[PDB]
Amino acid sequence: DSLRPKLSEEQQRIIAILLDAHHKTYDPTYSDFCQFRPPVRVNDGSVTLELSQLSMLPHLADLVSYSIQKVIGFAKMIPGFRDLTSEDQIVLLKSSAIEVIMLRSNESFTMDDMSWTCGNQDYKYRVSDVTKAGFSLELIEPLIKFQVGLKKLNLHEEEHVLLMAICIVSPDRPGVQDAALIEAIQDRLSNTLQTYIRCRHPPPGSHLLYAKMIQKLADLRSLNEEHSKQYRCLSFQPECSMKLTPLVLEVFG
Ligand SMILES: C=C1C[C@H](C[C@H](C)[C@H]2CC[C@H]3/C(=C/C=C4/C[C@@H](O)C[C@H](O)C4=C)CCC[C@]23C)OC1=O
């Protein structure tokens, strides 16, 4: 019964535009990473110790910051995103930033050892490194769970970039002015994704794939909510702002 329409010239161009945007903002080699403040890993195996020193915070905070910059770059390249007001663009970016960081980090995350591998031993990030940055298991364990669930979806790069686009352009963000326009753009992307899936993804990973992708966006809200609680606690630590960046402070604070 179900129709499988072809991708329109506009939909074809949109996937092209997005893929191109991603390749310009995601370094698959991770060759900027050494320019960050060096990672420090102390003896831990204690939340008191974690907050006392916060050895991994300056590095991961630099990574997060770096990523946010790339997300901003990426969002500005989304078809229609430039049509929104500067005020709206900022709101959408700030409230999706952390979600899209988690979302994009999937390219680096490996099921081999349940870590984020960005080359080396220095740039292999485990749960223990994220605790060393002052974040509790209440956020991390379900992040890994989300990361794994997303890996087993086996998304095409075409699907992966369209999802990052849909994440950003969400009309149900707190603070949006022109929610009608944002929804209009999101719809154009959703339909491209729904079309792409139906006529470009082979079974048995094709059936019910869109519904699972929308669900991952709901999990991303939970994590966003959790990150907010944990960043707030983290901020209360004295001389912590210096371990962050002017951009991470503004976007998350
Ligand atoms: C300073 C932090 C750390 C924390 C970030 C959280 C816990 C997660 C989300 C994505 C994770 C990671 C992402 C890894 C990368 C590397 C590469 O894939 C680029 C991508 O943008 C990215 C962030 C690995 C460590 C913990 C991160 C930063 O929030 C903060 O404010």
From Swiss-Prot:
The keyword Membrane does not apply. It is found in: Nucleus; Cytoplasm. Residues 10-253 form the NR LBD domain. One of its GO terms (cellular component) is chromatin. A motif (9aaTAD) lies at residues 246-253. Its main location: nucleus. One of its GO terms (biological process) is positive regulation of bone mineralization. The keyword Zinc-finger applies. Ubiquitinated by UBR5, leading to its degradation: UBR5 specifically recognizes and binds ligand-bound VDR when it is not associated with coactivators (NCOAs). In presence of NCOAs, the UBR5-degron is not accessible, preventing its ubiquitination and degradation. Calcitriol binds at Y26, S67, R104, S108, F135, H227. One of its GO terms (molecular function) is nuclear receptor activity. Keywords: Cytoplasm, Disease variant, DNA-binding, Metal-binding, Nucleus, Receptor, Transcription, Transcription regulation, Ubl conjugation, Zinc, Zinc-finger. It is linked to Rickets vitamin D-dependent 2A: A disorder of vitamin D metabolism resulting in severe rickets, hypocalcemia and secondary hyperparathyroidism. Most patients have total alopecia in addition to rickets. Homodimer in the absence of bound vitamin D3. Heterodimer with RXRA after vitamin D3 binding. Interacts with MED1, NCOA1, NCOA2, NCOA3 and NCOA6 coactivators, leading to a strong increase of transcription of target genes. Interacts with the corepressor NCOR1. Interacts with SNW1. Interacts with IRX4, the interaction does not affect its transactivation activity. Interacts with CRY1. Interacts with CRY2 in a ligand-dependent manner. Composed of three domains: a modulating N-terminal domain, a DNA-binding domain and a C-terminal ligand-binding domain. The 9aaTAD motif is a transactivation domain present in a large number of yeast and animal transcription factors. This is Vitamin D3 receptor. It comes from Homo sapiens. The lineage of its organism: Eukaryota, Metazoa, Chordata, Craniata, Vertebrata.
